[PDB]
């Protein structure tokens, strides 16, 4: 017994629901990823931009002393550079999905600048490598090797 018939989008659209849940319909992969980028930027853009800023190792530069130690942690562990490497090392198809996702964010911000907090404007535009750099911080340098276990603060 086969599943229900899969849906074939004919146009790129986000149908949002009453709870602000995006249903992103793309005619191909980069399109859906772009929609997804747009949506995430709408619902969470400010904090996403701040996080990407940090994972560039630009926390201290964009936002001063409160962000300095995470900056030292990520530079010392060569995170922003490694993310550029991992980005180049992506498969062509998936790398294109990432560029699209990043393009969605940039496009939402460009079309809706009022929605973007003054303090995170300087981070734009964001790149495929930003997207890889944040995921890399999250998995390896928050989950696996937290600054606390190494520095002995907890």
């Amino acid at each position: 017994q086969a599943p229900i018939a899969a849906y074939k989008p004919r146009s790129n659209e986000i149908l949002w629901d009453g709870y602000g849940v995006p249903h992103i319909y793309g005619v191909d992969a980069p399109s859906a990823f772009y929609g997804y980028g747009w949506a995430q930027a709408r619902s969470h853009g400010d904090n996403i931009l701040r996080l990407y800023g940090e994972a560039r190792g630009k926390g201290a530069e964009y936002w001063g002393p409160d962000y300095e130690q995470t900056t030292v942690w990520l530079l010392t562990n060569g995170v922003p550079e490694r993310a550029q490497q991992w980005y180049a090392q992506q498969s062509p198809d998936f790398r294109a999905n990432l560029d699209a996702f990043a393009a969605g964010i940039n496009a939402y911000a460009q079309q809706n600048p009022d929605d973007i907090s003054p303090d995170v404007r300087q981070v734009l535009p964001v790149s495929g490598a930003d997207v890889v750099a944040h995921a890399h911080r999250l998995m390896n340098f928050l989950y696996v090797a937290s600054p606390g276990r190494t520095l002995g603060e907890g």
């Binding site: 074939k8 659209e13 986000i14 949002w16 904090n47 998936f94 998995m139 390896n140």
Partner: protein
């Protein structure tokens, strides 16, 4: 976090069941979940992910779905270096550090930046950090060479079959997490996943401490493949679970034991009362419907009361203090559930904080210790009831100070408050036995408290044709200033009134409140 997958044999209708149930901070920005649905001519994925991630970690669709829990996979090592002559001692000889001169800009009060120099030193292990106390520490993180994390998740969550799923998982690009799988074909899987260094000696505790940084003996270079890791597929028990417990009771009956794996992979520590309930809730129930499966997810038993109050109460009634006596009778009459109307629950929590520590994980108070041979019924009892009564005495004082009374309704102190929404709490601390988790803050001066951590994204999916799923996001789908989609779900959470998750086009169209046409050109 909790995770359940249930095989068709254990269900009434003959379709697998899956629970996604991550517990993370309600405030930490990178821990914020977002719910979305992506549809192309070639794939479809529904579910939640941490903000800024382009792939859905908690995904399902018409064919399959997965969920995650923290396993603490030890994928890094911290080494204590022995400094000598500007280098470090290593295999009997002094070895110079690698060093580069980096720099960064630091924003000033007046909006300018200053360039600050940053020397980066490394040993053969990795980058070197100096601790506040002077300890030179080198950190060695495994899997710095797996650029494929996101694509693996992507290929996992869009897998056309379990073999494809397993093939993707086997790439070893996701460095951590228990990961649980289910599908419409009827397969369920549990994997203890991560990128684990192959080491010759040492248990997990050895590898979590400062490993000596003076010998190549400890400088690992290889990591384990997937089939070295604890895994379970379609066990005779008909379910798998994980609730952050060591992977030794992922199902019942178990399919392996700690001896089957290197001792540095997972701890062998007592399983939390929450984890014990997880096993019980699945094993003891059969012929499950999705409705019943949802009802079981809401469990909020004070298992610790079950283990302790039989010894505590009689000992407490012996005490000359009338207020201790009254406290004992209050506890005695309690049904042992974290409900809103409970007059005893707050008092019990305050006693357990002293009995079992602030985290409720302490073991030294129990009469019978935990044993993997009785993994859902130990530890048990009160070892020193006289001491425990003194703890009640203090706890009575603490409860009155924190909450104004020893019998304030649980749901009156325990509120979920987002924007202008303020609703009664139920459930509570995982380590007290509550499966559905709300890690209540310390109270304000009024004795009111709110979840710092707990239920965030919650979904339960039946892999029927079409699939049928329900979910809620505690803190809404948005956090942008002025959004109407921050506090619009917490009221439904207070009543456990789950949204039907909408995957079918017809359903999406019926529910649409906003359309955003877009177009992408690279």
């Amino acid at each position: 976090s909790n995770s359940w997958a249930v095989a068709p044999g254990k269900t009434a209708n003959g379709n697998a069941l899956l629970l996604q149930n991550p517990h993370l901070s309600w405030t930490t920005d990178y821990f914020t979940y977002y719910e979305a649905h992506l549809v192309t001519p070639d794939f479809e994925i529904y579910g939640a992910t941490q903000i800024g991630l382009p792939v859905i970690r908690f995904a399902f669709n018409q064919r399959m779905g997965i969920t995650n829990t923290v396993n603490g996979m030890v994928g890094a090592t911290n080494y204590r270096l022995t400094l000598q002559d500007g280098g470090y001692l290593y295999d009997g000889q002094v070895r110079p550090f690698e060093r580069r001169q980096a720099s960064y800009r630091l924003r000033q009060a007046d909006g300018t930046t200053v360039d600050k120099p940053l020397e980066i030193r490394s040993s053969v292990h990795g980058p070197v950090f100096e601790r506040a106390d002077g300890t030179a520490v080198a950190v060695r993180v495994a899997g710095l060479d797996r650029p494929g994390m996101l694509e693996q998740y992507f290929d996992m969550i869009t897998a056309d079959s379990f073999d494809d799923y397993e093939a993707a998982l086997a790439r070893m690009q996701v460095p951590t997490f228990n990961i649980v799988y289910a599908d419409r074909e009827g397969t369920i899987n549990y994997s203890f996943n991560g990128v684990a260094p192959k080491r010759a000696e040492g248990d997990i505790a050895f590898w979590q401490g400062n490993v000596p940084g003076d010998s190549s003996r400890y400088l690992w270079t290889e990591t384990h493949p997937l089939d070295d890791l604890p895994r379970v597929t379609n066990p005779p028990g008909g379910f798998v679970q994980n609730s952050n417990d060591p992977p030794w009771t992922p199902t019942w009956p178990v399919t392996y034991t700690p001896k089957d794996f290197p001792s540095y992979l997972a701890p062998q520590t007592p399983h939390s009362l929450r984890a014990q309930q997880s096993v019980r809730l699945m094993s003891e129930n059969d012929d499950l419907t999705l409705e019943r499966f949802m009802a079981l997810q809401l469990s909020h038993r004070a298992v610790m009361a079950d283990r302790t109050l039989p010894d505590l109460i009689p000992a407490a009634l012996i005490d000359p203090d009338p207020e201790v006596q009254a406290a004992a009778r209050l506890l005695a009459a309690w049904d042992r559930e974290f409900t809103s109307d409970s007059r005893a629950a707050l008092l019990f929590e305050e006693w357990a904080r002293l009995f079992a520590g602030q985290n409720f994980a302490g073991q030294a108070g129990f009469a019978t210790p935990w044993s993997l041979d009785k993994p859902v019924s130990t530890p048990y009892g009160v070892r020193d009831p006289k001491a425990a009564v003194d703890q009640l005495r203090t706890a009575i004082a603490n409860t009155k100070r924190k909450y104004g009374a020893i019998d304030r309704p649980f749901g009156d102190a325990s509120r979920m408050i987002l924007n202008d929404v303020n609703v009664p709490g139920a459930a509570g601390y995982g380590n007290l036995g509550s499966f559905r988790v709300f890690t209540w803050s310390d109270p304000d001066e009024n004795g009111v408290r709110t979840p710092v951590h707990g239920e965030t994204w919650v979904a339960m999916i039946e892999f029927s044709t079409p699939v049928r799923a329900y979910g809620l996001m505690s803190y809404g789908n948005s956090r942008q200033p002025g959004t109407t989609h921050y506090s619009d779900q917490i009221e439904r959470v207070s009543r456990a009134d789950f949204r039907e998750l909408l995957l079918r086009r017809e359903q999406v169209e019926a529910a649409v409140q906003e359309r955003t046409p877009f177009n992408f050109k690279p």
